[PDB]
C-alpha cells in the first residue's frame, strides 16, 4: 500500500507475480493459480498501485493462461485496513479530511465471504482463466460510510471536513516526497497518500456483466449491520455494554436475577 526505499509498487505488483507465474508454469503439477488484485485496478488509473496491479494482472494472465484473477472491493474484518483506519481517522485526530463531497461509490465485502470464494473457485473448473469481482450486496458512498461509522461509534460531533482534492494532495505531499530513503515507519496511514486521493475521485464497484459472488453460488453477507459491524461497536464511547436489562428480567427465574444482581 505504501512505497519504501527497499520496495516499489512494480517490484511487488509486477515483477514478482510475473516470475511466480513463470515458475508455476515450469513445474507442470500446479493446476491452479489464484492471484489477488483490487476492484479499482485499471491501467489508466492515476493512482500508481491500481495501475501496477492491472499491469501485473496482465502479466499473470500472459505467463500462466489458466490463472484466476480475483478483484474484491474493500474488505472488512477485525484486522482489516478499511474500517480500522477510518476509525483511527474519526478519533485520534483533530480533523478528518474528506476528498470533495464524498460521493464516490464503493462496494465493501466481508473477509469470510472472500475466504469462501477461494474454495468455491477451487471447486468450479470453469473459473480458471477468468476474472472475478467480489463486492457486497450494497453500494455505498464514502459519506454514507462515514455517517454509518459515526452513528455506530455513538460520536455526537462530526469532526470531518470536506476539502478540495488539491488541498488534500497539498497536505499529503510532504510525507510522500520523503517516503523513499526511509525503511518504512509505524502508524503511517495508507490513506495519507495522493494515490488514495486519486482513488477517491472514482467509483470502485462491480462492472456490469462481470462474474461475481452469484456465479460462485455465494450470497454475500451484509457489511453495514450484523456480525461485520460488531468489532466497531466495541470501540464506542464508554464501552459496548448491555443496558438496564430490567424490562425483560420481569419473568426470568429466581437465581438468574440475583446472579446478575438485577
Amino acid at each position: 500500500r505504501l512505497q519504501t526505499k527497499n520496495w516499489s509498487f512494480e517490484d511487488v505488483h509486477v515483477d514478482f507475480p510475473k516470475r511466480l507465474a513463470k515458475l508455476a508454469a515450469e513445474t507442470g503439477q500446479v493446476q491452479r493459480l489464484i492471484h489477488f488484485s483490487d476492484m479499482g485496478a485499471d491501467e489508466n488509473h492515476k493512482s500508481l498501485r491500481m495501475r501496477t496491479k492491472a499491469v501485473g494482472d496482465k502479466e499473470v494472465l500472459d505467463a500462466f493462461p489458466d490463472a484466476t484473477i480475483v478483484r474484491p472491493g474493500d474488505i472488512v474484518g477485525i484486522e482489516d485496513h478499511f474500517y480500522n483506519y477510518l476509525i483511527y481517522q474519526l478519533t485520534l485526530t483533530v480533523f478528518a479530511p474528506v476528498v470533495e463531497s464524498g460521493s464516490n461509490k464503493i462496494q465493501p465485502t466481508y473477509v469470510l465471504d472472500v475466504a469462501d470464494a477461494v474454495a468455491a473457485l477451487l471447486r468450479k473448473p470453469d473459473t480458471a482463466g477468468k476474472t472475478l469481482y467480489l463486492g457486497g450486496p450494497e453500494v455505498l458512498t464514502m459519506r454514507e460510510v462515514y455517517d454509518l461509522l459515526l452513528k455506530t461509534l455513538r460520536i455526537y460531533r462530526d469532526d470531518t471536513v470536506h476539502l478540495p482534492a488539491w488541498a488534500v494532495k497539498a497536505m499529503y505531499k510532504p510525507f510522500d516526497s520523503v517516503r523513499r530513503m526511509l525503511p518504512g515507519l509505524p502508524m503511517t496511514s495508507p490513506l495519507a497518500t495522493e494515490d488514495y486521493v486519486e482513488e477517491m475521485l472514482r467509483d470502485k464497484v462491480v462492472p456490469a456483466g462481470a462474474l461475481g459472488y452469484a456465479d460462485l453460488g455465494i450470497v454475500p453477507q451484509k457489511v453495514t449491520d450484523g456480525l461485520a459491524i460488531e468489532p466497531v461497536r466495541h470501540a464506542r464511547v464508554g464501552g459496548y455494554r448491555w443496558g438496564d436489562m430490567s424490562a425483560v428480567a420481569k419473568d426470568i427465574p429466581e437465581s438468574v436475577r440475583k446472579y446478575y444482581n438485577i
Binding site: 519504501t4 527497499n6 520496495w7 525503511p183 518504512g184
Partner: protein, 157 residues
C-alpha cells in the same frame, strides 16, 4: 549503509538479550505437572535466577506455561486468557496431557493437545517432566528468542 545495518543488528542483539532474560510466564496449574513447576521455582532449581517472575495477570505476562490437562470445559477460558496477553508472547506446553492428550487422549472430555486451541513454541515431554527437564525446555525457548531479528527485518521492509 554498512554502519546502519551493523547498528540495527546490534539493536536486535540487545533487544533479544533483554527479552530472553526477562521472561514473565503465567501459571496454568491445571494438574499433576503444576507440582513439578512449583519444584522448578523452589530453592533447588531457582527459576528466579534466570530472570523468571511468575505474574498473576495476563497483561504483565510474557509467556504461558500450560502445565496440566486441558478439558473441554476449560478450553475457552484458556483461549480467553491467551488472547489477553500482549505481544510478543510465547506458549510452553508441558507434559503429555497438554502435548497430545496423554493418558486421557481417548476421553469424551479432554482436548487432545493444547495445539488445538493455542499455538505452541516449545514442547516439554514427560508425565510429569522433571523440573530439570522444564529448565531445559525454558533454556531452549531462550535459544529461540535469541535467533529472532526484528529490527533487521523491519529495516529491510
Amino acid at each position: 549503509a554498512k554502519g546502519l545495518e551493523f547498528v540495527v543488528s546490534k539493536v536486535d542483539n540487545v533487544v533479544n538479550w533483554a527479552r530472553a532474560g526477562s521472561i514473565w510466564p503465567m501459571t496454568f496449574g491445571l494438574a499433576c505437572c503444576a507440582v513439578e513447576m512449583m519444584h522448578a521455582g523452589a530453592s533447588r532449581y531457582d527459576l528466579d535466577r534466570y530472570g523468571i517472575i511468575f505474574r498473576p495477570s495476563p497483561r504483565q505476562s510474557d509467556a504461558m506455561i500450560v502445565a496440566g490437562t486441558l478439558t473441554n470445559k476449560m478450553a475457552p477460558a484458556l483461549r480467553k486468557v491467551y488472547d489477553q496477553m500482549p505481544e510478543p508472547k510465547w506458549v510452553v506446553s508441558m507434559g503429555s496431557c497438554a502435548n497430545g492428550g496423554g493418558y486421557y487422549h481417548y476421553s469424551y472430555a479432554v482436548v487432545r493437545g493444547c495445539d488445538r486451541v493455542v499455538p505452541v513454541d516449545v514442547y516439554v515431554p514427560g508425565c510429569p517432566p522433571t523440573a530439570e527437564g522444564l529448565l531445559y525446555g525454558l533454556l531452549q525457548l531462550q535459544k529461540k528468542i535469541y535467533r529472532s531479528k526484528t529490527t533487521q527485518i523491519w529495516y529491510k521492509k
